[PDB]
Write a protein that binds this ligand. Structure first.
Ligand code: ZN
Ligand code: ZN
Ligand code: ZN
Length: 109
């Protein structure tokens, strides 16, 4: 019954980031870079999760484009999946293990 899609939306600016995470719902943010190997390896999992948890909003952020947002959120390892609810970080999953990311989403959705 794949009658519609959910997307992993790319943040354009810091202000869109700030507003998006303010919501009263799980917001999942994949911090990546085009140079990042493990990020590409986990991209497929994150896309699938976005359509597995339609009650959460999924986004991605290119640290080459919004390195400032990355700096404010203390993202260093890559990929980093940051999860927020009501303006507050609720998980910070570091690295490329799909199992941990899945546990974190399931915990917070
Ligand atoms: Zn149907
Ligand atoms: Zn789809
Ligand atoms: Zn749906």
């Amino acid at each position: 019954h794949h009658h519609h899609h959910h997307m992993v939306t790319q943040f354009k600016t810091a202000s869109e980031f700030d507003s998006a995470i303010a919501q009263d719902k799980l917001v999942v943010v994949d911090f990546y870079a085009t140079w990042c190997g493990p990020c590409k390896m986990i991209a497929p999992m994150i896309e699938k999760f976005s359509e597995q948890y339609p009650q959460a909003d999924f986004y991605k952020l290119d640290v080459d484009e919004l390195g400032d947002v990355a700096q404010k959120n203390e993202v260093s390892a890559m990929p980093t999946l940051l999860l927020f609810k009501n303006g507050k970080e609720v998980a910070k999953v570091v690295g490329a293990n799909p199992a941990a990311i899945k546990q974190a989403i399931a915990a917070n959705a």
